[PDB]
Amino acid sequence: DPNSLRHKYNFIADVVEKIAPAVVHIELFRKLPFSKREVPVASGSGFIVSEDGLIVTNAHVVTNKHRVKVELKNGATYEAKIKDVDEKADIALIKIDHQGKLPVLLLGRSSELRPGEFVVAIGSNTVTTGIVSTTDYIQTDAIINYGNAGGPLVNLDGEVIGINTLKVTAGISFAIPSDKIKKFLTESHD
Amino acid sequence: DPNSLRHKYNFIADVVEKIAPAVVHIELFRKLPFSKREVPVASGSGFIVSEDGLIVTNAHVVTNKHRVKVELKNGATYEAKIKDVDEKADIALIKIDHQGKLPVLLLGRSSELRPGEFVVAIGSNTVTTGIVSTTDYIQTDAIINYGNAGGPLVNLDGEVIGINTLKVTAGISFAIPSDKIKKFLTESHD
Amino acid sequence: DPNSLRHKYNFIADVVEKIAPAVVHIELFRKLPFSKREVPVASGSGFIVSEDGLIVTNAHVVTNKHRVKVELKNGATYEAKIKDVDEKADIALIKIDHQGKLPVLLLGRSSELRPGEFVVAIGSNTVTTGIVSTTDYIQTDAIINYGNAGGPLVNLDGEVIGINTLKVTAGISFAIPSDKIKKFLTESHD
Numbered sequence: 153d154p155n156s157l158r159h160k161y162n163f164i165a166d167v168v169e170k171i172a173p174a175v176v177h178i179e180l181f182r183k184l185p186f187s188k189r190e191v192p193v194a195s196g197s198g199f200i201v202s203e204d205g206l207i208v209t210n211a212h213v214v215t216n217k218h219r220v221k222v223e224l225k226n227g228a229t230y231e232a233k234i235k236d237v238d239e240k241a242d243i244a245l246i247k248i249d250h251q252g253k254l255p256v257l258l259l260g261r262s263s264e265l266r267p268g269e270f271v272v273a274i275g276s277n278t279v280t281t282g283i284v285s286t287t288d289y290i291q292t293d294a295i296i297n298y299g300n301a302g303g304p305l306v307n308l309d310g311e312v313i314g315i316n317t318l319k320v321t322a323g324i325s326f327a328i329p330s331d332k333i334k335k336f337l338t339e340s341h342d
Numbered sequence: 343d344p345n346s347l348r349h350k351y352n353f354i355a356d357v358v359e360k361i362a363p364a365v366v367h368i369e370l371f372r373k374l375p376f377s378k379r380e381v382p383v384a385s386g387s388g389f390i391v392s393e394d395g396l397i398v399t400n401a402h403v404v405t406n407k408h409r410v411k412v413e414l415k416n417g418a419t420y421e422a423k424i425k426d427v428d429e430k431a432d433i434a435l436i437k438i439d440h441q442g443k444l445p446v447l448l449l450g451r452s453s454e455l456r457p458g459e460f461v462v463a464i465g466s467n468t469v470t471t472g473i474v475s476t477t478d479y480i481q482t483d484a485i486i487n488y489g490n491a492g493g494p495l496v497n498l499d500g501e502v503i504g505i506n507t508l509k510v511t512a513g514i515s516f517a518i519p520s521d522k523i524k525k526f527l528t529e530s531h532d
Numbered sequence: 533d534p535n536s537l538r539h540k541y542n543f544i545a546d547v548v549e550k551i552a553p554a555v556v557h558i559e560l561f562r563k564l565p566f567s568k569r570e571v572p573v574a575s576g577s578g579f580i581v582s583e584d585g586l587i588v589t590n591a592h593v594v595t596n597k598h599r600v601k602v603e604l605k606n607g608a609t610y611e612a613k614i615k616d617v618d619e620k621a622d623i624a625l626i627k628i629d630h631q632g633k634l635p636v637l638l639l640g641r642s643s644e645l646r647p648g649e650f651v652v653a654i655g656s657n658t659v660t661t662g663i664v665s666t667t668d669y670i671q672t673d674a675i676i677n678y679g680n681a682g683g684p685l686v687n688l689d690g691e692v693i694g695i696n697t698l699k700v701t702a703g704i705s706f707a708i709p710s711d712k713i714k715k716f717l718t719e720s721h722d
Contacts, residue, residue, distance in 0.1 A: 158649075158688035161650065169646065172647070270352060270355075279647050283354055283470070283471050293484075294673075297703055297704070307348055322487035323485040457552070460541065460542060512678060
């Protein structure tokens with residue numbers, strides 16, 4: 153039955169299946185006090201914004217300090233390189249040397265978001281959904297935790313319209329807008 | 343693409359765009375101890391149930407005590423007047439003298455709610471959504487906080503079927519039913 | 533208007549109306565210290581997986597210890613009998629002697645769940661909804677509390693794809709999968 157409710161109405165499933173591949177797991181490693189032996193300090197999610205392997209996450213998953221390894225949905229790990237890390241903006245860009253063209257999430261214009269729009273908050277995997285709760289930051293219903301922090305908050309078209317953050321206020325989560333990411337990204341390409 | 347998921351399925355956005363104008367921000371002001379100088383004690387949301395400017399909220403946003411100012415979505419502030427405040431019912435009615443016909447939210451019959459119905463919880467702006475979790479009060483999934491307390495909980499037709507309240511139990515929010523509001527409202531018109 | 537949003541899009545209401553009858557309220561009673569006088573120790577939900585009145589819940593609503601009474605949506609109470617209680621699996625099967633064929637929830641294959649699928653978490657009544665947050669246990673957005681613990685987590689077809697559990701982690705609820713239930717159930721029929 154394509155007249156069935158499950159087929160007719162799992163539009164979030166449809167979005168997640170489309171974006172999961174471009175969402176990646178990031179791990180921050182620090183060196184032990186007087187050792188050459190590094191160990192993971194921070195873990196998070198990010199996503200790919202370019203075929204050759206540019207990746208964006210927030211400044212908490214990645215900070216210029218440490219060493220970063222990326223792991224792709226498929227399960228191959230990759231030493232990643234830190235191209236830029238704006239702390240004020242809470243955004244980070246890293247690059248991995250992948251063999252062949254990668255899958256990419258396009259950015260949506262977060263000024264077009266309408267209050268009430270469904271969005272999907274996704275990481276590495278773990279996915280929650282909700283709506284845009286306010287027209288800075290984008291606020292939302294959707295739970296954000298360590299499973300999806302750093303990862304994208306997307307609209308029903310599969311367009312990144314935020315980065316998930318762990319800031320929460322009275323049940324409401326906060327994400328950095330894609331418009332800040334657009335900005336950040338163009339000012340790095342300098 | 344009107345075949346796009348974002349167009350096809352943002353029905354909550356569609357409801358919010360329709361009701362936002364009739365949802366208003368209320369502020370309760372008290373006089374300082376021995377001064378003529380008043381200051382805001384309480385803040386909340388309400389909505390309009392009549393063109394000339396009758397407005398309903400709960401008895402926590404407004405209580406016969408203080409002084410109330412209303413601010414409309416558009417941003418004009420207005421001294422509001424307290425027409426009735428049932429404490430047992432946790433409902434309040436106030437009136438503002440607006441220049442011209444205002445937008446109005448109709449009441450739905452909250453006995454018709456079916457378990458599982460999507461409802462939208464809205465304030466001033468900030469919006470959350472969920473479902474009716476139980477057939478007194480209407481219980482629901484949707485987060486209610488200071489952003490939308492006092493404001494309406496509506497059904498997918500844009501009909502007020504509750505007032506948002508800050509009572510919460512094991513994750514579940516409570517709203518005063520429109521049927522109590524209908525009651526309250528008719529017993530005031532006395 | 534069947535072109536109305538409320539008619540067009542309350543698919544969760546539609547599912548809940550279909551499954552509510554097969555969802556039941558369970559109560560665990562223990563004997564007072566040196567008395568014949570028993571009193572309720574635990575309360576929960578379950579559901580029916582057979583016309584003659586087999587019922588499943590988790591091992592927390594029911595444990596081989598106590599005495600169990602079932603109450604049906606309609607409101608008739610029934611002494612229930614404990615047919616099997618796997619503690620490691622956190623599943624329990626009980627049987628009630630009902631007069632006539634009861635309504636039954638079929639099991640879906642929880643390996644078919646896709647991340648993002650809407651599911652509905654239901655008890656006795658109280659209902660919450662969310663999505664599958666991870667491909668062991670099924671994780672989800674939906675609030676699970678005492679209102680629906682023990683009860684089924686279902687997919688949009690009305691197929692039980694989990695049992696609701698009170699385990700929670702960073703906002704995310706856990707349910708025992710239908711595939712474990714299938715397993716459990718066939719190994720009991722021994």
